[PDB]
Copies of this chain bind each other. A is one copy, B any other.
Amino acid sequence: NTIKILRTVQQVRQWRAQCFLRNESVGFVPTMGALHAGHCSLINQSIKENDKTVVSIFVNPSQFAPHEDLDNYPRTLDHDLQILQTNNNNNKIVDAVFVPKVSEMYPSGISLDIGKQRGAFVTVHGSSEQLEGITRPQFFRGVATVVTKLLNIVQPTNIYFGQKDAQQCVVIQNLVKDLIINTNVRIMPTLRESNGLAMSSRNQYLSQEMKDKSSLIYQGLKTGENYYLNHSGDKVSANEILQQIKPIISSDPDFDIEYIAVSHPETLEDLDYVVPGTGAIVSTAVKVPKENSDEKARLIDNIILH
């Protein structure tokens, strides 16, 4: 009837053991808090597909680099609980939310200084170094490590991720494949504002004109997608797809394009051709102006070719 807040691993074990006893499937949505409509899309899918659903809220230290001041990451638990309650008014419910301390998730300790780290860590080699990993070479080892721990605590039937973090989704798919984990990885299409802007935590605090300006990014990617579709079931030049997107995201002089890539959906290696039956991940990272000064927000988005 109401959401159980689980603070410790043993509390989750007890909660999950009762799900086991009841023969209930268990969906799992991992988050770092600061919930928004995108997270609710995942949660609502978990509720459709599973008898019971649990959400985690944990700001994972090991995906941050030492030069980042992790102490100013926003803690918004009361807000997040409200999101979860308001979404529940709009539907089974979210049954439990897991909000651990760092020491529960890292019983042997954790440092941002990799030279000081101790204990078990997981690296998905070959999925972690390119694209988003270039500016954050430590990031996907942190992600794979904490998702492994969460999967071992919750032991879900299904775990849910949003397509907007495309490389992250590939890292998790290969994590589950390679560690041979008994869970389904469910990748949900990105939830978008009306104008096509991918949902993010920035959205709700930007002016309408700000969000409208940023919707050009998706508009660029959609043009590349429409190009590939018209050419069918013969292979399509990846570079020719890139030439449809870049001039459109370039149409705004204020945007700084960090990359636009056409990548194999399993190995993330650059493609020369997109083949129907295999497809591609077409992803980008773009710097857009924030509100004032020279501070700029880094937005990512992508579209999947099949």
The chain A residues found within 8 Å of chain B, CB to CB, are 9, 13, 105-108, 117-126, 144, 148-149, 152-153, 155, 174-175, 177-182
Contacts and interface: CB of A to CB of B under 8 A. Distances in A.
Nearest to A183: B152
Given A149-B179, A152-B179, A152-B181, A118 B107 contact: no
A76 B121 CA distance: 34
B120 A175 contact: yes
Contacts of A119: 124-126, 174, 177-178
B125 A117 contact: yes
Given A108-B174, A174-B108, A177-B107, A152 B182 contact: yes
Contacts of A125: 117-121
Given A177-B108, A180-B153, A144 B120 contact: yes
A13 to B, nearest CB: 7
A210 to B, nearest CB: 39
Contacts of A179: 120, 122, 148-149, 152
A138 to B, nearest CB: 14
Nearest to A118: B126
Given A9-B180, A179-B149, A181-B152, A123 B124 contact: no
Contacts of A153: 180
Nearest to A106: B178
A148 B174 CA distance: 15
Given A108-B177, A180-B149, A180-B153, A122 B120 contact: yes
Given A118-B126, A149-B178, 7 more contacts: A117-B125, A119-B126, A119-B177, A120-B179, A122-B179, A153-B180, A155-B182
